[model samples]
Target chain A: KDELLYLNKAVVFGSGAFGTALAMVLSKKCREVCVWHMNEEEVRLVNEKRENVLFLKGVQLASNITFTSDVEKAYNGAEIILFVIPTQFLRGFFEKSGGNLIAYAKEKQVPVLVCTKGIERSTLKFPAEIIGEFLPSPLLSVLAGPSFAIEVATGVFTCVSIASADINVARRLQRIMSTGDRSFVCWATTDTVGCEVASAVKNVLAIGSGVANGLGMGLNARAALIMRGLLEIRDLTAALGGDGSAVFGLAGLGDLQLTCSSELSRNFTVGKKLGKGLPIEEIQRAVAEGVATADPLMRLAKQLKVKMPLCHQIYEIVYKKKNPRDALADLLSCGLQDEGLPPLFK
Target chain B: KDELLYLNKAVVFGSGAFGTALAMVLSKKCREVCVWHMNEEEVRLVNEKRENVLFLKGVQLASNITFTSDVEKAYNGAEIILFVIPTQFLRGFFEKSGGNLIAYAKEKQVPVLVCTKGIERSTLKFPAEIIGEFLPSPLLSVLAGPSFAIEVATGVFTCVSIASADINVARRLQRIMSTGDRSFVCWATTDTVGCEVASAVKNVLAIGSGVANGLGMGLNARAALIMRGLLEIRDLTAALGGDGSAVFGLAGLGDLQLTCSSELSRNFTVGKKLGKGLPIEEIQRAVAEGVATADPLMRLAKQLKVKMPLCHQIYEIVYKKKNPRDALADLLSCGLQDEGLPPLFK
Candidate 1:
């Protein structure tokens, strides 16, 4: 019970599956966790049933969690705020009624954690950058790793990395999220940008992994793509003045492995469909965040002069409608073996 | 045909599945590829059917590949030698008819590549070190990667890392092995010892991956185990004077991912059985190479003062007959998240 008092109140910005799942986790650590939702019916159903049937169906939420459309009430006494809005909608959330709520948190000096992992299509800015636009010099942290929200919600053991530019906030938030329980564990890093880049590109690269599998390129090719793709991610992470080591942490390789292996991953599913020669637009069910980030990621890679063959092929196959088999052929046939890499995580 | 002439002849010291697979790959490049086998009947059968039915069944052997029992004939005029013998039996082979073959290769100054990846149980020496005792200051190389023998034998796309202290041999041999084709490609590394260490521990760590899945720990835990295990592998690789970067290359992460993902890996199968409450010795139709290396690996990690909870858990479970769930619980309960890691491959 003493551990539960570590944080008196917490609030979540989005009420999707991940947002509700995390609210359940935060409910254990805080006296109250208010999930801020926009839909009137969605919010009422959650509060009435003490469950989020619309998002995380068939799971019990804590009694301490309050689901509501009242943004001001949700943000009233929050000690920490987690932004779990999807990357595409993050800007809109703040532009509307959500914009006023941030002012309260900023004035109260509450630590804000970003759980979204992608670049904004219009601005090519990461969630951290997008959040930075709203709350300048705020105690911002980013959370990432190989987590399936279902697993975290179900109390399956999970691990993640939390990063912030402010080392103190990184560690403090790490403790708050842990709840000293078997349900989750998280490592912390001070390279928020590294965590952002590593986390962002994972959704993009998972598509490449699925495409390899769908094209009958086999496990060997998929593994090679992941290793090479990670090198590219580390290169980009360093190019962006982020620590390369953070790429190997939970946010990068761990998340990459999980997303690629599971059919549950929307990004992998989209790539799998694309590789099987299905038109991307034909399969219209919320394809993936990678689809949005591919163009922007490729453009950034080109502007920085970083050699990203694996990611570039993903971009080509995803955006230009290049054949998946031909793209894989182009990747393996390259004469670029033994490209110099800095010593591993040293 | 001109590229095929890059290496006039190549000899493989083992007639196991991987040796035969590599021999098939080399036959496309070398003028004559000799596969040395002790079993006279096995050699005669391979020569008769042009296939290795005993190990790699139903794959057509190249016409240029000779399955031979005559050591002198196999060694004569060989441009390079590949050691694909299993690690445990490696010493015994050297003590017998194989002893004379190594002497001739040493006298001829042929480049020797160790395809074996394990520590000798008696000496705790790696394949490279074991070979070093026989041939002093000879041009030595190590081949390691996430390749299934059937994949390489059937001309499926494969990528491996070739590491050597002699960078010239690493690149030169990389070309000879590639055959300038898509069947298989290799990257070069000058850190042969690093490759040796990275390759050695993959099998051991793969057991951990298998154990996680067998316990129904789910994909999230498995991915976390892999990432953490790789960190431990890198730490050991650096401790052994190996370049840390090699651990993240094709030899390390690629192979680890492949081995852990598939049931085709013997090490993973052994671990799976152990995790499911099957006795290690009870289910014995070729257990794993990791069983032999686990004790040696734990001893080495202890002597070097490396913090390797994942690998250590694998060691405890495999050797001490500790319960797998209990071991996992102990690992997750540790207050060791956010431990400092060197900035990833810079």
Candidate 2:
């Protein structure tokens, strides 16, 4: 198969919106770009409709990307594998896979790039580390940036960062990854932990901004949210030995711009719904993943001694049963001196 | 008249919106501040309404500011005289007055501050140089910053830079002046000529941005305009012997923000109206002063060799009869190569 139609067999696991769009991008560079759908419905829909309409609606999937329901049929003999499941589902889903997939990839020594963003609810570790804990491969890389799958699939210009500890692996992977429509892909200090930490924490901050916007706060207030929220994220990432510039790049500030701006974003949608005085649980039911990152991120913030006012207020409003407006007012009215420029970027 | 309930006597020439409101701000600081009106109807309205109802509507004017049609009565025996006329109107108005008031002020040695912006159209010298030439004085200063008169009247936060060559004069004026609300006054630099020049030139650039906004351009485009526009301003100021930091400070960037954002700002309003498809002459009728700043600044650009695409296009659209949409399309189609950080201050 390698020489028959193409040189590489690139596999994308989990048929999510981001995963499908990424699969379409990889199709330009590789011959057999396979997307593994764990859900039978997604597999059937992709095979029948030639698209993942539930996720990548209106984004045409190229002919090179093959979709399948069987895990082994999709996962076996891949040069690179991308795991795109939601963070909450990754551990349970991986634990239940019975180690066959990891063993197969390890035998072939194929590197796995974790494309998901979030902190594990129980361990407070990033998705990459969680995957590494169970999968056991040093060939772990992270792909992140201010990318909206909608824009990426349509070839709208975008830039992103790929982080890996191994420089050779990062460069090799960078060549194979296609940047559609003049989009740039830059390799940084290759600190996966830092990139993952920034990627996860900024989502929570976006939630805070959503609440502020829903409360009718203007642009000045939103700028305050982004600047201060990045400060909180930097404190935590720096403690983990991640270089600060990673936060300023596509992974941190850039991703924040994409996720926070869109009403279609699951995080923003949840926060906006919550800000309009809906119950957190009800909003969660409507938009599937808002509260998933908050609990673990708050735990990380406490361990790092970083006072995240907006994140803390989000925690109180979501978990401690506090009024969202009062939480916001209290956060703002605190007798705090100016913290200066946010440490989000070095 | 000598014992008019105020500790200080002030005469403000020019009754434009900003001029009218600045007179109101000064009204609070002085006991007897007379605002000289060039139009009899405006003067009659101010006296009848106790406010420049045409401009500072609903803002209560202090009893100290007396609006008058007779310019001589307003200037008579005043301790400080402020030139608040538009940059274009300054020379013609000065020529019309025929130096009688200057002889009167020189006889009394009253300190005069040039509050207007822009260079002389005929000689292409800064307003300060022109004022110094026509009404020479050792007691001269330039005052400017980011403040809407309506905002200043309501105690909205604002800061301004006062520049003068003489240290003692700058210090004395800073102390004597100060609205003491959220408004603050500070000495910036001795290069008063350069400061006025940058302030005037940026208003021309703001019209460029307004046209972009009218054309439905987004934030990224606006930033591109400012980042590039400022380089041209910096080059011109450097050529004019102004300190680099002054252009990046309250007078240049800060004033640019105030001009571009606020609806009360005459420059922005003119641009916004033009963006909505209003004729240039119609916008000119509404805002003659800010439009007058365009050609003088463009002339300065050529003389100083500053590259200003946005400003140049705006001048063409306004004066050379270039279509706005075509100018914008031409500007956007060009590739941008600069990737340097904008000048920053801690």
Candidate 3:
């Protein structure tokens, strides 16, 4: 029923778990889907064997998808470009692989869909805003939601958002991409800053939730923690000059739910281990992305003067050298605020 | 800080898991906690063996708690009368056990905290309303929230509501009961019928959620189902002449969250097995309570002309003899509704 459709060829740049799994989803809808990986040997292995061993370990690639190490070949004739590299690697990835490609994309007027989540750690900018610096096109969009890579690859139904400042681009992407199956697509729009800010802060809240549970807190407390944790995320997002609506969207609540609850999530796992009485030094040694993401989240909170008691506990336990158990105890000791949260989405 | 607190004596009537747990919690705060059980064996066993074998399983009775089969003996000197018997059983239990013993409770004005959940199977009256009809003025209150008795017994901190039409009685119950550790209490002056309706309809919704997930619907769909399910619940509640705020409170959202998601819940487990391809009959033979509960829930929804699509599917599959998988397929095939939920509270 989607009248507006993109031409069949679609390209996703990034071979991480999310990108690869999403490529598998797109493969079902489009005539051809190409996945661009930076690692040549891995790309070659995927091309030869139809699998991603490093990123998505067990899921086999769809037969219609092609793997390429060369960004130019992958991007050359593709009608839709989905930028999916992680926030930390976006600068290096774009610089090395697709530096001049945005100009080329603008020349062709190709709609570039953003799938990566997080503030660009270096620039403290949204990936789309950073991509705008490079690509500078009106055809920029974002696809974000609770897409677990393994689940998506196996055809478990998933939902995602296709957001763009330009409503036409958002609508276009939503139509071409939505498959009523795993690729259930919806359209949303926001300033570039809010989307990235909410996405970045949700990860930290997910970690906080994980820590709360891992420390043997019961389900009632966990429910409270999830509500308060989201408040922390929203406060941080709004104070940092981001949109409240963006915090309620799929990228915020949806992502936080998946990341905090599942053991498969690196962030949740890190927090869980800390809750299990793991030494802080040992947690630091492990070095998952979420572990590194915490300090900046708390720093940003302090700068903005948001009352993130949950996040503050996490920051103390992880960075200020407080024991994880003591940190948890301290959190519980704080007076129970008024129960019930403000509406989750305004 | 309750200034009216003297040396307190709390009596938890009934010997179920909830009653025994409440007795245990009260025993810690008050000098004495008395338990009144219907079973003579439960009384004899508690007196002789220092444990409630049938109901509490393994938790030893605290030295402060005394168990009695004689209802008048238990009621005559109690400051608080805690009723944790099931809703259907409340009328019969009171009628047979201690109907003529009201003068003892009236003279002392011992608060009757109705902890059991549900409406009458036949009359469809709320437990508190049913009790109110049978007994004269006894500072009536309800203990409702997101709690499992076993979890509360094992010291997992949980939250509940001590709701009463009388603010003074509600606050008194909140103080004398609720040990601040895991039992944070909230107060409200809602109609007892609203609380009863919320508790009954939510399990029906949980069954719906199980069916949705069983259909291999994604997390987004499940979240949508919860919001939608709540709407259907509200409609039915309103039809029953209940206040709308009930569906958003401890008895509604909180209890639904606990019962629907947890593995310990009978209804969720029943829905899950059906979702995992077990026949409804096969699943029903395994658990009695869920199957029994489904018919009344469906009957109630139909009487109100409420569009409970999810509950209807479960009812059709289990009760009306429709194939479970077909009902599920039809649900998936239905036209999409807007994901936005109507505003719940003022």
Worst 10 residues of 2 chain B by lDDT: B337-346
Best model per DockQ: 1
Candidate number of the best TM-score: 1
lDDT of 1 by residue, B151-209 (tens): 88887778888888776778877887885566688888877766787777888888887
DockQ of 3: 0.22
User: What is each candidate's fraction of native interface contacts (fnat)?
Assistant: 0.61, 0.00, 0.12
State each model's C-alpha RMSD to the native: 2.6, 8.7, 4.4
* Backbone atom clashes (below 3 Å) for every candidate: 4, 1, 2
> Candidate 3, clashing residue pairs?
A158-A182, B157-B182
Expressed as tens digits, the lDDT of each residue in B166-285 for candidate 2 is 745655565555544313334334556556866787788878767766765544334335545655666677777765555544555456544654444566667766777787876665
Worst 10 residues of 1 chain A by lDDT: A336-345
Model 2: residues >4 Å from true position, as ranges? A1-7, A98-100, A103-109, A134-138, A166-171, A180-194, A264-266, A281-284, A334-339, A342-346, B1-346
Query: Interface Cα RMSD for all candidates?
Result: 3.9, 11.1, 5.9
Best by lDDT: 1
Docking class of 3: incorrect
After superposition, the stretches of candidate 1 with alpha carbons farther than 4 Å from their true spots are A1-5, A281-285, A344-346, B1-5, B344-346
Q: Tell me the TM-score of model 2.
A: 0.61
Q: Write the per-residue lDDT of candidate 1 for residues A98-141, one digit (tens) a residue.
A: 66687787788898989988888788788988988888654789
Q: Candidate 2 docking category?
A: incorrect
Report the error of model 2 at residue B101, Å: 16
Q: Higher DockQ: candidate 1 or 3?
A: 1
Instruction: Please tell me the TM-score of chain A for candidate 3.
Output: 0.89
Point out the higher-scoring one by TM-score: 1 or 2. Answer: 1
